[PDB]
């Protein structure tokens, strides 16, 4: 019949840093999930058929409208499968994002992320930059909050989900993962991969998979499979046939 | 979850040329079943049946690709009256060999319906070594696939071609042009140009090979000539197959 799903990422597990966190290395991302958007049958079968491909990564945010509130009911049953990634400190109110990294909305919105997603703890909090790294991780509450909400047991490491090589680096000295980027178009964040392998630290890359040029994915993902230091790839695909292949070329890739 | 195979070509078939026969903008290769790895007897019933749901209809083989023909027959019982077959004569232990004879093109022809399991097949293109322009005029092989056209036999007739100028030769008389065209060989354009002046049929080999996807990239270029009908893939990779027809329906909008 349909066996189709031959390749899947089941074996390939690694480590996220030295969090004790084991993820496949691809994530689903979940911004579409709140933003066409996925129909509540749609959004189960993509996060089932995701776990028969081997994924346990899972990616969102206060900001991805609410793909929150949404994962809590659809991951009944299922939560303790997941490793979940979610941010703090972009908000998108009426027309535009919004930031904020008091201490105050810090952990007002890890207590609603908490809420919403039906569980009393999430695997890995990153901080939601507006591009000026450094100086939130500097000047603001945002990081020491969450190095408390990680003590309490609310959160279980936390790190920065940054668009500057020196932000990623900071976030590495005192927090536990970097999010960055890095495709076919964009390295500059390399040193920041380097550095992670460097010291058992978690990086996880966003937009892998965009381009200006012997699949595009399947360059992709050698370019940044290549780099020893990266844990994960988050992919954003809502279409199970896209998914299932992106997932093979992942595993091609890795050989 | 067992539809992602979402998007499928069943209401984009296509009339190829006058024959009166309506096909799928691909159709399916079978040259790795039976090998100028080879799908398992299993492997290849999966590939069939995910054509099929995937709205495709035609099927290219030929006497030269192995056991491809001796193989199918066995695997399209139950199913023939849904498929479209095209095959070939001409090409035959190391090497090729080639005979254009009249007694060789009706014993090949005999031997294709016996292999199949039918009385019949759509489709029958002369296997050119490249010296199209002289087999069509100086062997037997063409005015004999006119014959066995008339005895019923064999539905319509071509060349699967070479060179510009045997194509065109093909469609003068016969039925129906095979005709390389990709992203790197486009020579063959003016046979499709002619083909579609003259309600007259086109099948695109090699679709696929080159030097934002490259496979839609492809089909775009191939379905922007309106005289093409069908492009064959080879493919037996059962997602690889899903995703060409994705990127083929998306082509043709």
């Not at 990564?57 to 409208?65: H, K, M, S, V, W």
């Not at 990081?143 to 940054?162: D, M």
């Amino acid at each position: 019949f349909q066996s189709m799903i031959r390749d899947t990422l089941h074996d390939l597990h690694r480590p996220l840093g030295d969090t004790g966190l084991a993820v496949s290395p691809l994530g689903l991302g979940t911004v579409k999930f709140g933003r066409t958007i996925p129909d509540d049958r749609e959004a189960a079968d993509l996060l089932a058929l995701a776990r028969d491909l081997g994924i346990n990564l899972i990616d969102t945010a206060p900001a991805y409208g609410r793909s929150e509130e949404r994962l809590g009911p659809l991951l009944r049953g299922q939560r303790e499968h997941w490793v979940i990634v979610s941010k703090v400190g972009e908000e998108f109110v009426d027309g535009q994002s919004v930031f904020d990294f008091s201490a105050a909305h810090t952990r007002r919105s890890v207590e609603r992320s908490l809420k919403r997603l039906e569980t009393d703890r999430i695997e890995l909090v990153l901080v939601h930059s507006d591009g000026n790294d450094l100086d939130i991780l500097e000047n603001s509450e945002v990081y020491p909050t969450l190095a408390a909400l990680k003590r309490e047991g609310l959160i279980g490491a936390y790190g920065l989900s940054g668009k500057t090589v020196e932000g990623g680096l900071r976030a590495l000295r005192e927090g536990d993962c970097a999010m960055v980027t890095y495709n076919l178009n964009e390295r500059a964040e390399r040193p920041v991969i380097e550095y992670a392998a460097a010291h058992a630290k978690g990086i996880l890359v966003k937009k892998a998979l965009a381009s200006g040029h012997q699949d595009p994915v399947r360059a992709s993902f050698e370019l940044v499979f290549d780099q020893p230091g990266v844990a994960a790839a988050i992919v954003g695909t809502i279409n199970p046939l896209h998914l299932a292949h992106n997932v093979a070329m992942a595993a091609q890739a890795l050989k």
